[PDB]
């Protein structure tokens, strides 16, 4: 059970690795730290990079890299990259003030931490975002709610009443990506885009595209979405950098 | 600002296990010698150099000697423009393997005129099992140059790679 994979650097050079099919992102990073004579920072990261749509995401430590590769279309020319990422576990280091005052609800550090990582309750994340309404090239500014069951927007201002809520996306079977330095100008209001791509083991894998007002607003959203999707596992990854 | 023209060259370093393919490549790119042995599957390298008054980007593919990975050979041979054919001068087995590489390239690319340099590496050693003249012949036989190198000493590293580029350019 082995697969040869290619991992790229920023300079667009690459190294091939023949790895067992059950290998994690953590284990590939550690392999590459050793082979390249680097020093383990804990910031080394494998990224899933989708060049045709201009987005990338951090591959979480525990994910199986071959399962990530399996969800690729064969004409897509997707790539794995290896570089440092300092923001990855920023919420875990400085939790109590990570999220802005108005954006969350359910102040102590491990209070907020425990509320975000529970498998029962999720907090609520709410704020404006720009969304590309489906099939159309235009974008609208709308109020959104992130909850345990997923992401919703209000058809009427900021109103959280069930009457006004519209389901936008699940994250059980979607992955979260952040846009690189590519053309926003497929309509987008800013360069701070992010998007959800369904697993191929769903139905049609249409991109749900979003866009924040500010970089920092995106980071909070993507972080909230990550914590909701992976929950306690994210924290375990961070708290056990070597797992063994 | 200003537009800047640049030509790229796709070089591929081929040869049996442990002949010094990576040590030579790393010496070229990174100006230092790797004493340890680190099995290669397929590693890619980039270097901007000026050759004969022209600005070039060398994309260098450092490949596997391991037969376990021979299925990958066909892709890098179609894609490659120039091939550095390396054997070690203290290893006769390696010298016989390079015949097969030359032939696989000849066939995959479908041409008798593929840019190539035969490289006799590890020239810094006392225990020669392949004589210079022996390889001088096989080179003449192919019509390609022969350059002896040492990754350990840096002897003929730049020579070998820049010659291949010149072979590419003249073809
Ligand atoms: N004395 C001497 N040793 C060398 C020279 N070049 C490489 N070596 C040594 O031989 C061993 C193998 O060299 P590599 O470059 O790793 O061999 P390779 O041909 O790339 O092997 P694969 O990647 O498996 O194809 C290493 O220990 C090197 O230090 C040289 O010019 N002189």
Numbering used by the authors:
A (entry chain A): 106 to 211, 219 to 356
B (entry chain B): -4 to 166
Passage from the reporting paper:
Previous structural and biochemical studies of Grb14 established that: (i) the BPS region inhibits the catalytic activity of the insulin receptor by binding as a pseudosubstrate in the kinase active site; (ii) the SH2 domain binds directly to the phosphorylated activation loop of the insulin receptor kinase domain; and (iii) functional RA and PH domains are required for negative regulation of the insulin receptor. The small GTPases N-Ras, H-Ras, and K-Ras serve as molecular switches in cellular growth control, cycling between a GDP-bound inactive state and a GTP-bound active state, and gain-of-function mutations in the Ras proteins are found in approximately 30% of human cancers.
We determined the crystal structure of a complex between Grb14 RA-PH (Grb14RA-PH) and a constitutively active mutant (G12V) of H-Ras loaded with Mg-GTP. The four copies of Grb14RA-PH-Ras in the asymmetric unit are highly similar and superimpose on one another with a root-mean-square deviation (rmsd) of <1 Å (410 Cα atoms). As first observed in the Grb10RA-PH structure, and more recently in the RIAM and lamellipodin RA-PH structures, the RA and PH domains of Grb14, together with the intervening linker of ~40 residues, share an extensive interaction interface, which creates an integrated two-domain structural unit. Despite low sequence identity (<20%), the Grb14 RA domain adopts the same ubiquitin-like fold of the RA domains (RBDs) of RalGDS and Raf1, consisting of a five-stranded β sheet and two α helices. The PH domain adopts the canonical PH-domain fold, comprising a seven-stranded β sheet and a C-terminal α helix. Specifically, Lys111 (β1) of Grb14RA-PH is salt-bridged to Glu37 (switch 1) of Ras, Arg120 (β2) is salt-bridged to Asp38 (switch 1), Asp123 (β2) is hydrogen-bonded to Tyr64 (switch 2), and Lys140 (α1) is salt-bridged to Asp33 (switch 1). Mg-GTP is bound canonically to Ras in the Grb14RA-PH-Ras structure.
